[PDB]
Amino acid sequence: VPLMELSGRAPVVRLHDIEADMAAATDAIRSQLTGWGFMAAEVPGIGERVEAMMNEFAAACRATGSLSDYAYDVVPQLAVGGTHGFFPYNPKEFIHVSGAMIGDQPPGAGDVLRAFPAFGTRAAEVFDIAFRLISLFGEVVRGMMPPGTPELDLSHDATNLRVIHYRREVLAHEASGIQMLGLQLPPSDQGLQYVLHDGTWVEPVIAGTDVVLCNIGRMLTSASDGRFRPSTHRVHTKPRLSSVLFAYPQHKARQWKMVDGELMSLNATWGDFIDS
Numbered sequence: 001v002p003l004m005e006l007s008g009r010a011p012v013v014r015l016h017d018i019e020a021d022m023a024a025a026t027d028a029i030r031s032q033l034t035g036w037g038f039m040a041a042e043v044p045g046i047g048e049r050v051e052a053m054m055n056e057f058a059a060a061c062r063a064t065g066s067l068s069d070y071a072y073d074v075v076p077q078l079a080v081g082g083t084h085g086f087f088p089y090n091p092k093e094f095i096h097v098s099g100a101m102i103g104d105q106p107p108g109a110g111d112v113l114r115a116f117p118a119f120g121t122r123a124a125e126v127f128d129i130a131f132r133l134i135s136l137f138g139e140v141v142r143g144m145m146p147p148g149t150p151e152l153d154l155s156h157d158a159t160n161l162r163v164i165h166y167r168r169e170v171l172a173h174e175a176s177g178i179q180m181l182g183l184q185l186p187p188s189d190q191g192l193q194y195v196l197h198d199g200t201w202v203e204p205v206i207a208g209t210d211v212v213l214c215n216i217g218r219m220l221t222s223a224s225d226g227r228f229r230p231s232t233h234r235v236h237t238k239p240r241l242s243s244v245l246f247a248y249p250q251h252k253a254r255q256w257k258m259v260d261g262e263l264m265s266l267n268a269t270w271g272d273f274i275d276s
């Protein structure tokens with residue numbers, strides 16, 4: 001599977017200059033979505049923050065003073081919404097850090113980030129940078145879409161940072177996101193690959209880099225009435241951590257499509273979109 005070098009080549013977007021640096025990368029990013037399934041940006045300093053987060057997640061996975069004390073089924077959820085907290089092994093381990101969890105929105109939901117406060121501080125930092133980046137990546141996609149295209153309205157409380165441990169050859173079968181957009185963050189190991197428009201595979205060179213990928217999710221495919229296919233991807237590995245931000249709109253908001261240039265408010269909510 002051909003390797004795709006990105007560090008040195010993707011637009012550069014600086015932590016202290018995100019709004020400006022993303023405006024200046026609009027043209028590049030559009031051409032990526034058009035040329036590849038997906039989009040890419042180099043964010044100098046993101047690598048160090050993501051490696052430190054992931055390393056502290058691993059440590060916490062083996063700690064027993066335990067993450068499973070905050071398994072999804074014992075953490076307060078929101079009435080309507082997705083499910084945040086730790087998902088035990090029996091993606092192998094994995095945690096979902098929502099914006100609600102960061103703000104103790106269901107009071108008691110941020111208790112994992114208080115039990116493991118070093119991973120929590122780093123995960124809250126990574127969430128905030130990744131949400132800013134993903135919302136500006138979505139304004140680029142909206143600008144490639146017909147006039148009248150509404151704002152994506154990505155919700156901070158519904159967005160989740162997934163951090164995975166242990167993800168013997170194929171670690172994923174080909175998959176895409178349910179949600180509007182994903183931000184892939186530089187993983188520990190190489191293996192994540194994307195399908196191109198020609199139906200061939202590339203392996204982004206992203207392990208141990210400052211490169212983030214942005215993924216089209218099936219909600220956006222639906223709202224763009226087919227014009228943007230999901231950024232379908234898989235993971236191959238050779239005898240291990242990873243994290244990705246899944247941006248959702250508010251569950252209770254009405255779905256919408258741009259069909260041949262016309263905006264159509266639908267009956268079903270984005271909530272209903274997930275419940276298949």
Ligand SMILES: Nc1ncnc2c1ncn2[C@H]1C[C@H](O)[C@@H](COP(=O)(O)O)O1
Nearest residue numbers: 091172175176177178179182217246274
């Ligand atoms: N085992 C497992 N559980 C959950 N999500 C996974 C898993 N493997 C891959 N994914 C990812 C990839 C997609 O966005 C998304 C599907 O949402 P979903 O919540 O699955 O409808 O979750």
